Design a protein around this ligand. Structure first.
Ligand SMILES: [Mg+2]
Ligand SMILES: [Mg+2]
Ligand SMILES: [Mg+2]
Ligand SMILES: [Mg+2]
Ligand SMILES: [Mg+2]
Ligand SMILES: [Mg+2]
Ligand SMILES: [Mg+2]
Ligand SMILES: [Mg+2]
Ligand SMILES: [Mg+2]
Ligand SMILES: [Mg+2]
Ligand SMILES: [Mg+2]
Ligand SMILES: [Mg+2]
Ligand SMILES: [Mg+2]
Ligand SMILES: [Mg+2]
Ligand SMILES: [Mg+2]
Ligand SMILES: [Mg+2]
Ligand SMILES: [Mg+2]
Ligand SMILES: [Mg+2]
Ligand SMILES: [Mg+2]
Ligand SMILES: [Mg+2]
Ligand SMILES: [Mg+2]
Ligand SMILES: [Mg+2]
Ligand SMILES: [Mg+2]
Ligand SMILES: [Mg+2]
Ligand SMILES: [Mg+2]
Ligand SMILES: [Mg+2]
Ligand SMILES: [Mg+2]
Ligand SMILES: [Mg+2]
Ligand SMILES: [Mg+2]
Ligand SMILES: [Mg+2]
Ligand SMILES: [Mg+2]
Ligand SMILES: [Mg+2]
Ligand SMILES: [Mg+2]
Ligand SMILES: [Mg+2]
Ligand SMILES: [Mg+2]
Ligand SMILES: [Mg+2]
Ligand SMILES: [Mg+2]
Ligand SMILES: [Mg+2]
Ligand SMILES: [Mg+2]
Ligand SMILES: [Mg+2]
Ligand SMILES: [Mg+2]
Ligand SMILES: [Mg+2]
Ligand SMILES: [Mg+2]
Ligand SMILES: [Mg+2]
Ligand SMILES: [Mg+2]
Ligand SMILES: [Mg+2]
Ligand SMILES: [Mg+2]
Ligand SMILES: [Mg+2]
Ligand SMILES: [Mg+2]
Ligand SMILES: [Mg+2]
Ligand SMILES: [Mg+2]
Ligand SMILES: [Mg+2]
Ligand SMILES: [Mg+2]
Ligand SMILES: [Mg+2]
Ligand SMILES: [Mg+2]
Ligand SMILES: [Mg+2]
Ligand SMILES: [Mg+2]
Ligand SMILES: [Mg+2]
Ligand SMILES: [Zn+2]
Lengths: 65, 71
RNA sequence: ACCCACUCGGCACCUUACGAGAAAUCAAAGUCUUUGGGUUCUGGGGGGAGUAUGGUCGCAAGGCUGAAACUUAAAGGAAUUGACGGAAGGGCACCACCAGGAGUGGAGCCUGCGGCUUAAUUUGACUCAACACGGGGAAACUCACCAGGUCCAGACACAAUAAGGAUUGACAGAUUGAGAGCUCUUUCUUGAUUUUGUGGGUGGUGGUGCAUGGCCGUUCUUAGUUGGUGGAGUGAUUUGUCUGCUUAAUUGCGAUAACGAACGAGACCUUAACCUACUAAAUAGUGGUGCUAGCAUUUGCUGGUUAUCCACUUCUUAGAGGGACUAUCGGUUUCAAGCCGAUGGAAGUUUGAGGCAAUAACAGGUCUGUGAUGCCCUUAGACGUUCUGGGCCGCACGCGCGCUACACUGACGGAGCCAGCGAGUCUAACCUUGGCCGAGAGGUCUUGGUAAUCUUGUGAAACUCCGUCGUGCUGGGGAUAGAGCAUUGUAAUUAUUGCUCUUCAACGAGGAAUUCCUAGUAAGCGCAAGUCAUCAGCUUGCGUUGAUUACGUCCCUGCCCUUUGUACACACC
């Protein structure tokens, strides 16, 4: 998919030797968190903000200013 | 593949012949020098270059061929 | 006779496993390096071989006893994971079938393949996954093939020749297809650039895709791959990754010695749909106004006018947003994931269609895309290259993709008259409107455009309407062939293509077979783009007209999955 275009660089290189040639194929996948100028995460990613304990009750009452 | 055939007769090349040449020019009894063979009135060939003597034919070789002066 | 409890001794099963084992497994195969209850028998790597020999028993066939030489690095056991089967159980799919549509298979031609022919008819590829494929529509070129002619563009090093010239070129004639000084005659020219030899290079559409890279196709219209902590196992391993249900999906639910995750699917991206909300526009358009034509006249109706001005953004353009999450409701389901129906909605089949796409495999195709490349071959009487000419088109015939037809839901003739995706000329001749001339093809003079500006509203074709014909190989059909005219091109003969007249074939719905397809789809219909000097019956996209039939299954076929067997693991070639 699309994240491929966004996050992985590839290169093929032909390395000519005494016997024949070999194909080097390099693939690098870069930290998307660091994206900088694009999307900062995979389309996959789904973060939930973590609530907060509450200490409720305290029967009514009102503040004045 | 197939290899070879030939109803024969291979073609050769050329030679530039021999000739200890430019004897042509003649100097009299000490020491006046007269040119044999006439030279070229083309601006390109400042009259050092001569004309070969055939028949009808006098011809400038320096002009790689160029021009047909006839006397 | 039957039931309950007990107990000796039987044939067995069940669950455990403290314990054993290399494991499979085992209440003995336990009580074994913490090694001793009694006793009997047999084995000491594989083959050679239960062979030779002697003894013995037998009527015999044979039985018992039973060697060595020599050969050899493994043979063997159990389990694991793969791979594979002409074993079994499940699934998925219009490259499967059901219900059907439109066909192909029959005909004419077009075009590839075989075959034959040939100087040559260059060549790759042969089930799906070779054959309108190599973007492969070849007149030269391309081009590799064939008949023949030039050239070196043979780096460099050493040696040799050699300034008394190493070498170079050529006018005319001869030659030659040729205005190739190819060679020859002849005799000027040139000046250390070459020549000759060896060494070494260099080019090659020469060989090897079974030496390679890269790319691509296929498996795959598939759903699979892995690691952390836990559990099992001495171990390779396994569980997680599973009976079921569910999904297009190892997509999920659920079950659960597993829990929680990552690659792949999904997400993501592109394009088609919806925004009287946002920002705008003489390279897009609308309303008002002026200038103005025509028809009515009573306002009116229908046009002209890239700026005569004013305002707008519904339509067009493209930025930014918004929108859908199978929403609401209800059926159904283990009331789970889901599935179904109704309403709403631009939109509810993964929204439609694509792009991307893991792990692994193949001796799939490509050395003929590459100045990617190993090795082999070849290298001046070239397999380098170029030039002239022919050839890839050759035709008893087999095969594939196609085009056009057999007519009356039609052909012909008037007339109506509507798309979308494209593309176009600088140091050049591309897209072409308009005016004339021409039956046509085309010609000619001008013209706008490097483009939302001009071609172009690309006035496309099927289609619609009024006529002619009237079922007759007919006015359906347009093969084959003759004559003439033009266009591209240096060149049109074997006829590039276009036009006119004439000639008027087979084909009366196509055997056995076989392809493709579920909605703006199928089928019909044209167009633009690729190729392109010229040539589309091909492709790639595009819009126009627009259905019948399923919404299911495992019968055929194909494939994945379990279970199972394996003496395979280079893995059933
Ligand atoms: Mg995806
Ligand atoms: Mg002289
Ligand atoms: Mg056990
Ligand atoms: Mg035990
Ligand atoms: Mg017991
Ligand atoms: Mg032994
Ligand atoms: Mg023996
Ligand atoms: Mg005996
Ligand atoms: Mg005996
Ligand atoms: Mg007897
Ligand atoms: Mg014995
Ligand atoms: Mg014996
Ligand atoms: Mg031995
Ligand atoms: Mg096994
Ligand atoms: Mg059927
Ligand atoms: Mg049929
Ligand atoms: Mg060839
Ligand atoms: Mg296939
Ligand atoms: Mg040629
Ligand atoms: Mg030459
Ligand atoms: Mg040499
Ligand atoms: Mg050599
Ligand atoms: Mg080559
Ligand atoms: Mg291969
Ligand atoms: Mg390869
Ligand atoms: Mg081959
Ligand atoms: Mg399908
Ligand atoms: Mg499994
Ligand atoms: Mg695993
Ligand atoms: Mg799938
Ligand atoms: Mg009025
Ligand atoms: Mg009025
Ligand atoms: Mg708008
Ligand atoms: Mg509705
Ligand atoms: Mg979409
Ligand atoms: Mg092969
Ligand atoms: Mg290649
Ligand atoms: Mg080669
Ligand atoms: Mg190429
Ligand atoms: Mg390359
Ligand atoms: Mg060659
Ligand atoms: Mg051909
Ligand atoms: Mg064939
Ligand atoms: Mg095909
Ligand atoms: Mg008509
Ligand atoms: Mg005329
Ligand atoms: Mg102009
Ligand atoms: Mg338009
Ligand atoms: Mg008839
Ligand atoms: Mg007709
Ligand atoms: Mg011709
Ligand atoms: Mg021919
Ligand atoms: Mg007729
Ligand atoms: Mg029919
Ligand atoms: Mg052509
Ligand atoms: Mg075209
Ligand atoms: Mg083609
Ligand atoms: Mg067995
Ligand atoms: Zn001269």
């Amino acid at each position: 998919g699309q994240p491929v275009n966004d996050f992985i660089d590839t290169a093929t290189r032909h390395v000519l030797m005494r016997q024949g040639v070999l194909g080097i194929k390099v693939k690098i996948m870069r930290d998307p968190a660091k994206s900088r100028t694009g999307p900062k995460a995979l389309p996959d990613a789904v973060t939930i903000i973590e609530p907060k304990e509450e200490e409720p009750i305290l029967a009514p009452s009102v503040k004045d200013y | 593949x197939x290899x070879x055939x030939x109803x024969x007769x291979x073609x050769x090349x050329x030679x530039x012949x021999x000739x200890x040449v430019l004897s042509y020019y003649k100097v009299d009894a000490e020491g006046k020098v007269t040119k044999l063979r006439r030279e070229c009135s083309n601006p390109t060939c400042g009259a050092g270059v001569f004309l070969a003597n055939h028949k009808d034919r006098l011809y400038c070789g320096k002009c790689h061929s160029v021009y047909k002066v006839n006397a």
